[PDB]
Design an enzyme around this catalytic site. Sequence first.
Site, PDB file in Angstrom:
ATOM      1  N   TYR A 122      29.531  34.979  35.028  1.00 16.22           N
ATOM      2  CA  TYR A 122      30.634  34.053  35.173  1.00 16.22           C
ATOM      3  C   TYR A 122      30.355  32.759  34.397  1.00 16.22           C
ATOM      4  CZ  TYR A 122      34.149  31.299  37.562  1.00 16.22           C
ATOM      5  OH  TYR A 122      35.227  30.499  37.875  1.00 16.22           O
TER       6      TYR A 122
ATOM      7  N   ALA B 167      18.873  40.255  38.046  1.00 16.37           N
ATOM      8  CA  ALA B 167      17.905  41.293  38.337  1.00 16.37           C
ATOM      9  C   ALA B 167      18.625  42.529  38.850  1.00 16.37           C
ATOM     10  CB  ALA B 167      16.930  40.802  39.362  1.00 16.37           C
TER      11      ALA B 167
ATOM     12  N   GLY C 185      47.647  31.164  43.600  1.00 13.73           N
ATOM     13  CA  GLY C 185      46.506  30.273  43.507  1.00 13.73           C
ATOM     14  C   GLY C 185      46.725  29.212  42.469  1.00 13.73           C
TER      15      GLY C 185
ATOM     16  N   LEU D  94      23.004  38.782  41.296  1.00 12.62           N
ATOM     17  CA  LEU D  94      21.821  38.325  40.622  1.00 12.62           C
ATOM     18  C   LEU D  94      21.544  39.184  39.385  1.00 12.62           C
ATOM     19  CD1 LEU D  94      19.645  37.900  43.793  1.00 12.62           C
ATOM     20  CD2 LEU D  94      20.628  36.016  42.380  1.00 12.62           C
TER      21      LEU D  94
ATOM     22  N   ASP E 138      47.812  43.284  31.402  1.00 16.69           N
ATOM     23  CA  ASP E 138      46.368  43.066  31.295  1.00 16.69           C
ATOM     24  C   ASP E 138      46.049  42.233  30.037  1.00 16.69           C
ATOM     25  OD1 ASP E 138      43.438  43.486  30.720  1.00 16.69           O
ATOM     26  OD2 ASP E 138      43.532  44.820  32.455  1.00 16.69           O
TER      27      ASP E 138
ATOM     28  N   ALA F  73      43.810  32.976  33.914  1.00 15.66           N
ATOM     29  CA  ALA F  73      43.293  34.217  34.500  1.00 15.66           C
ATOM     30  C   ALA F  73      41.758  34.260  34.477  1.00 15.66           C
ATOM     31  CB  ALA F  73      43.875  35.435  33.805  1.00 15.66           C
TER      32      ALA F  73
HETATM   33  N1  LIG Z   1      37.609  27.315  43.482  1.00 18.73           N
HETATM   34  C1  LIG Z   1      38.295  28.055  42.617  1.00 18.73           C
HETATM   35  O1  LIG Z   1      39.233  28.997  43.095  1.00 18.73           O
HETATM   36  C2  LIG Z   1      38.046  27.856  41.140  1.00 18.73           C
HETATM   37  C3  LIG Z   1      37.082  26.908  40.747  1.00 18.73           C
HETATM   38  C4  LIG Z   1      36.743  26.781  39.387  1.00 18.73           C
HETATM   39  C5  LIG Z   1      37.381  27.590  38.433  1.00 18.73           C
HETATM   40  N2  LIG Z   1      38.318  28.523  38.818  1.00 18.73           N
HETATM   41  C6  LIG Z   1      38.927  29.320  37.750  1.00 18.73           C
HETATM   42  O2  LIG Z   1      40.301  29.010  37.715  1.00 18.73           O
HETATM   43  C7  LIG Z   1      41.080  30.122  37.394  1.00 18.73           C
HETATM   44  C8  LIG Z   1      42.026  30.324  38.563  1.00 18.73           C
HETATM   45  O3  LIG Z   1      41.310  30.355  39.796  1.00 18.73           O
HETATM   46  P1  LIG Z   1      41.480  31.558  40.852  1.00 18.73           P
HETATM   47  O4  LIG Z   1      40.402  31.450  41.852  1.00 18.73           O
HETATM   48  O5  LIG Z   1      42.874  31.553  41.351  1.00 18.73           O
HETATM   49  O6  LIG Z   1      41.142  32.808  39.900  1.00 18.73           O
HETATM   50  P2  LIG Z   1      41.467  34.348  40.323  1.00 18.73           P
HETATM   51  O7  LIG Z   1      40.191  35.097  40.323  1.00 18.73           O
HETATM   52  O8  LIG Z   1      42.167  34.368  41.658  1.00 18.73           O
HETATM   53  O9  LIG Z   1      42.357  34.978  39.106  1.00 18.73           O
HETATM   54  C9  LIG Z   1      43.663  34.504  38.861  1.00 18.73           C
HETATM   55  C10 LIG Z   1      44.706  35.590  38.605  1.00 18.73           C
HETATM   56  O10 LIG Z   1      44.514  36.181  37.321  1.00 18.73           O
HETATM   57  C11 LIG Z   1      44.673  37.574  37.437  1.00 18.73           C
HETATM   58  N3  LIG Z   1      43.912  38.404  36.496  1.00 18.73           N
HETATM   59  C12 LIG Z   1      42.642  38.908  36.589  1.00 18.73           C
HETATM   60  N4  LIG Z   1      42.408  39.678  35.485  1.00 18.73           N
HETATM   61  C13 LIG Z   1      43.515  39.660  34.727  1.00 18.73           C
HETATM   62  C14 LIG Z   1      43.844  40.247  33.523  1.00 18.73           C
HETATM   63  N5  LIG Z   1      43.123  41.252  33.049  1.00 18.73           N
HETATM   64  N6  LIG Z   1      45.115  40.026  33.008  1.00 18.73           N
HETATM   65  C15 LIG Z   1      46.049  39.231  33.640  1.00 18.73           C
HETATM   66  N7  LIG Z   1      45.694  38.654  34.829  1.00 18.73           N
HETATM   67  C16 LIG Z   1      44.466  38.876  35.357  1.00 18.73           C
HETATM   68  C17 LIG Z   1      44.345  37.968  38.873  1.00 18.73           C
HETATM   69  O11 LIG Z   1      45.141  39.079  39.252  1.00 18.73           O
HETATM   70  C18 LIG Z   1      44.671  36.702  39.645  1.00 18.73           C
HETATM   71  O12 LIG Z   1      45.948  36.775  40.228  1.00 18.73           O
HETATM   72  C19 LIG Z   1      40.099  31.275  37.240  1.00 18.73           C
HETATM   73  O13 LIG Z   1      39.762  31.470  35.890  1.00 18.73           O
HETATM   74  C20 LIG Z   1      38.839  30.831  37.927  1.00 18.73           C
HETATM   75  O14 LIG Z   1      37.766  31.446  37.255  1.00 18.73           O
HETATM   76  C21 LIG Z   1      38.669  28.663  40.156  1.00 18.73           C
END
Ligand SMILES: NC(=O)c1ccc[n+]([C@@H]2O[C@H](COP(=O)([O-])OP(=O)(O)OC[C@H]3O[C@@H](n4cnc5c(N)ncnc54)[C@H](O)[C@@H]3O)[C@@H](O)[C@H]2O)c1
EC number: 1.1.1.212
Lengths: 427, 425
Positions: free
Chosen positions: A333, A278, A197, A276, A240, A269
Site C-alpha cells: 500500500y 515476510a 466513502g 507483513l 474496472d 479508487a
Molecule cells: N482512512 C481512510 O479511509 C483513508 C485514509 C488515507 C487514504 N485513503 C485513500 O483514499 C481513497 C478513498 O478511501 P476509501 O477508504 O474510501 O478507499 P476504498 O478502499 O473504500 O476504495 C474506494 C472505492 O473504489 C473502488 N475500487 C476499488 N478498485 C477499483 C477498480 N479496480 N476500479 C474502480 N473502482 C475500484 C471500490 O469499490 C471502492 O468503492 C483510497 O485510495 C484510499 O486508499 C483512505
Amino acid sequence: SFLARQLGVPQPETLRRYRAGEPPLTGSLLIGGAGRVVEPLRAALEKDYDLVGDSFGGLVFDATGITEPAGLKGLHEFFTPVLRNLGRCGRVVVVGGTPEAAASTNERIAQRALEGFTRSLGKELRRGATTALVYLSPDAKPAATGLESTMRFLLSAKSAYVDGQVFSVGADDSTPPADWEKPLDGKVAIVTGAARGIGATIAEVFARDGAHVVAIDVESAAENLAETASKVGGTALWLDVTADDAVDKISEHLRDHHGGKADILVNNAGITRDKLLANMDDARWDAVLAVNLLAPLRLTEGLVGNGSIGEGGRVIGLSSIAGIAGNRGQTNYATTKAGMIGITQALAPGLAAKGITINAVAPGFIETQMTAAIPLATREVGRRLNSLLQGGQPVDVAEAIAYFASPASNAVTGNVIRVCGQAMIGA
Amino acid sequence: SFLARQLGPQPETLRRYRAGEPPLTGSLLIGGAGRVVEPLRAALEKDYDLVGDSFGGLVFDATGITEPAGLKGLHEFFTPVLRNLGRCGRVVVVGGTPEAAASTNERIAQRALEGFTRSLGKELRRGATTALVYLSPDAKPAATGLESTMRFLLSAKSAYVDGQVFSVGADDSTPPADWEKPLDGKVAIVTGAARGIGATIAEVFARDGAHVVAIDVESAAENLAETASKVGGTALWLDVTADDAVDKISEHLRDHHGGKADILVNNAGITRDKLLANMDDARWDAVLAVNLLAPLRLTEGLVGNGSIGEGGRVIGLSSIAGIAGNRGQTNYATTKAGMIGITQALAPGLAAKGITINAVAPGFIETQMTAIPLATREVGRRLNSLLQGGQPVDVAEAIAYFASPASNAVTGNVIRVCGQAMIGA
Ligand SMILES: NC(=O)c1ccc[n+]([C@@H]2O[C@H](COP(=O)([O-])OP(=O)(O)OC[C@H]3O[C@@H](n4cnc5c(N)ncnc54)[C@H](O)[C@@H]3O)[C@@H](O)[C@H]2O)c1
Ligand SMILES: NC(=O)c1ccc[n+]([C@@H]2O[C@H](COP(=O)([O-])OP(=O)(O)OC[C@H]3O[C@@H](n4cnc5c(N)ncnc54)[C@H](O)[C@@H]3O)[C@@H](O)[C@H]2O)c1
C-alpha cells in the site's frame, strides 16, 4: 473521546465546516508583516473578509520581507500579542517566498526556517484553530492573484482538517472563478471509486461547487454508485480502472455525455490487501499496485494524451499518510501511495506545459468504513493522535481536493497536502 | 499501563561499534539488478561475508527498476529472505535519484521506494533497521562515492538510524588509508563539547584519528578540560555568538594547526522553551543567536578566511523538532529548521569549493536535557521502531560518517537519528 483520561487529552473542538451563506471566518482578519504580500492581500480580501482595521478569525503573517535570519524576530513580534485573541477555529497562515528561489542564501535560510515555526505553532493553538505555511514564487507579480485560491481555502471552514501543512504557489497569474462559492461551475469531473466513502463525498462537494460528476466504480458496488450519481445529479459508470480498455471506456462516456472533454480527474479508487512482507504473496502485492499506482498513472496518461483532458485541466491523486511515514503490514500500500506522490511530482512539469495541474491529497485518520474496521483501542488512539484531537471526515478530504480543482488554483501544482489535522506521525 | 498492555514492546539491546568486532552479525546478501550490485559486490568482498547461518545484511539494488510494474522486484527479493535476517540486521535499498531519472516512469517508481523502506522499517524485528540510499545516475559505474554510505549503514555504527533516506551525488571517491581510522590526520572544530552529545562527538572523532578542537563557554571550563584531556584534543573557551568568534577560532588554528581545520561541527545549542503567547525577546533572541545566527556566522566566516577549504566538512545539528515542530518551541524549532536551511542553502556554493555540508536531526537521546518528567520521557523514549531512546554515540557516529574524507559525494543531507521516531512531517 472515551480514552481522554487514559491518554491525558482534551475534549475535541466541534470543528466548524463549510455552510453556504455563513461568513468564511468567525472573526476579523489581521494581515501583518512586511514584504510583497501584505498590501495585495489586504486588497484582495477587503470585501469578502473583515479586515482589522472582539476576536480574531484569521492571522496572516507576511514573512517575505524577511531576507535574513535576524528578521525572524518578527514572527515573535507579530504573533505574541495576538494569539491571546485567536477565536474558535481560527486560521494562522505565514506566507513566505520559495526558499530554493530566494535572492540570497541568507534569505533562503530564513524562509526555510519558517516551517519549524509554523508546525510548532500548529501544536500550541487551541479550540480548533490551525496553522499553515504558504510559499509564493518571487516571480509572482505584485498583485499575486495566483495566491488567492490558497488563501481563501485556508481562511475558511473548508480547511477544517488541514493543519501544519506547507503549500507551494508558483509564479503564474490567476483568474477568480465567477463566484468563489460556486468555483467549479460547468466543470466535468471524473471521480474514481465514487460508490461510497471519500470518493462519494468528493462527488458531493464537486457537485456542490457546480461540477457535472462522472462517478466511477465497479459493478459490485452499483447501487451505492447509483445512489451517489442521483444525489450529485451526475452519471454512473461501471468500470474496472485496471482493465486494458478503461481509458477507452471513459472517453466514450465523455463522448456520449460531455462533448468528449473533462476538466478534472480524481484518482480516488484504491484497495488495501495488508500483510507483513515476510508473509506477502504475489497476488496481494500485484492487486494493490494495479489499482493503486498502475491505474492512476494510466488514466492520467491516457486521458491527457487522448485529449480528454486539456488546457486548464486538474488531476488530484489520493495519497495517504502511510505513503510518507510508512506503515507496518503495508509495504504494498505505502509503495503505491508513495508512488502516487511520484506521479504528482514527476508529471507536474510536462503537464504544466499543457496548462494542466496535478497534486495529491494525503488523508490522515478519517472516519470511514476501514477506520471503523480497526480494533477500537488502536483505532481510538489513532483517531486522537493529532493537534486537532479527533478523526477527519470525508468532507475534509474532498474540500482539499476541491481547492486543487479550482480554476483559480492554476498556480498550484506538484503539491502534496496532508489532510490529517496535524497528525503527529510523519517522515 | 492498560493501554501499554492493550497495544502490544520488546526493545532489542542495540549493538554499537567496537574496534575489532565484524561490522555485521552475519553474511551480507546483495541482490536485485542495475548499476550498483556488481560494483558493490566487489567493493565489499574483503570486509564482508558475501553470500556466495543467517543474514547480517540485505542490500537490494533497485536502480534497475524503470517502471512501476517493476516495483514487484522488491517483493520477490525480500519476501523469501526476511525471515532469516539477524539481530540488528541491516536492510538497504539503493535507487537512482528520482529527480534525475531518465523517464517519468522511472521517477515514479524510484520515488515510490521510500514508501517501501519506511514501511519495512516498521516491520523488522530484533533491532534491525531499513535505509534508502539514492545515487545520482551520473555516478561512474565504479560507484566509489557510494561506499562510505554503504559502510556506515552496513555496520553497527548506524545502530540508531532507521527508516532514513540518504542521497549521494556523482562525485568519485578516494577511500581513507584505514576505514577503521577514517579521520586520521584530520582537525575538527566541535562546538558545544563540554557535555553530552558534543562531548561524545569529540570522543568518536578521536577514535577515528582526529585532532579535536573542543569548544565551549567560560562557565563550562571544568567539563571542557575533561573532554579535551580524554580525547587528546585542545580546549577553547568562547561564546559562539561573540563578534570575535570566527577570529578567536582562527587565532587558535594558527597557533595549533597551521591555520587549517578540516571539519566544523555546529553542535552548540540551547533551549528556552516557552509557549509563543508568553514568549519574550530574551528567550526568542538567545536561541536564535546561538542556534542559527551563530552556526551560520561560524561556517561562512571559517570558510571565508580560508580556515576550512578544499576537502572540508561542516556538519550541523538539526533536531526532529525543527522537522515536525513542537509545543513551546517556536523559537527552538525555528532555529533547527533553520539548520536544515543552512544545510540546503550553503550546499551548492560549498560544493563548488570542495566542501560538503550536512545535518543531523537527533530523535530522543538519553542525555542530561532529556530533566523531562517521567510522563513525557517514557513515551518519546518508546515512540520509534526500535522501541527505545538513543545514545550520544549513535548521533556522533552519524556525524562521523558525514565527516569522512570518503563522504565527498554526500552533501545536502539531513539525516534523522531517531531509531525511526514516529513523529515527523
Ligand atoms: N482512512 C481512510 O479511509 C483513508 C485514509 C488515507 C487514504 N485513503 C485513500 O483514499 C481513497 C478513498 O478511501 P476509501 O477508504 O474510501 O478507499 P476504498 O478502499 O473504500 O476504495 C474506494 C472505492 O473504489 C473502488 N475500487 C476499488 N478498485 C477499483 C477498480 N479496480 N476500479 C474502480 N473502482 C475500484 C471500490 O469499490 C471502492 O468503492 C483510497 O485510495 C484510499 O486508499 C483512505
Ligand atoms: N539532547 C537531545 O535529546 C537532542 C535532541 C534534539 C536536538 N539536540 C541538539 O544537539 C545539541 C546538543 O545538546 P545536548 O542535548 O547534548 O545538551 P547540552 O546543552 O548539554 O549540550 C550543549 C553544549 O553547548 C554549550 N553551549 C551552549 N551555548 C553555547 C555558546 N554560546 N557557545 C559555546 N557553547 C555553548 C553548553 O555549554 C553545552 O556544553 C544541541 O544543539 C541540541 O539542540 C539534542
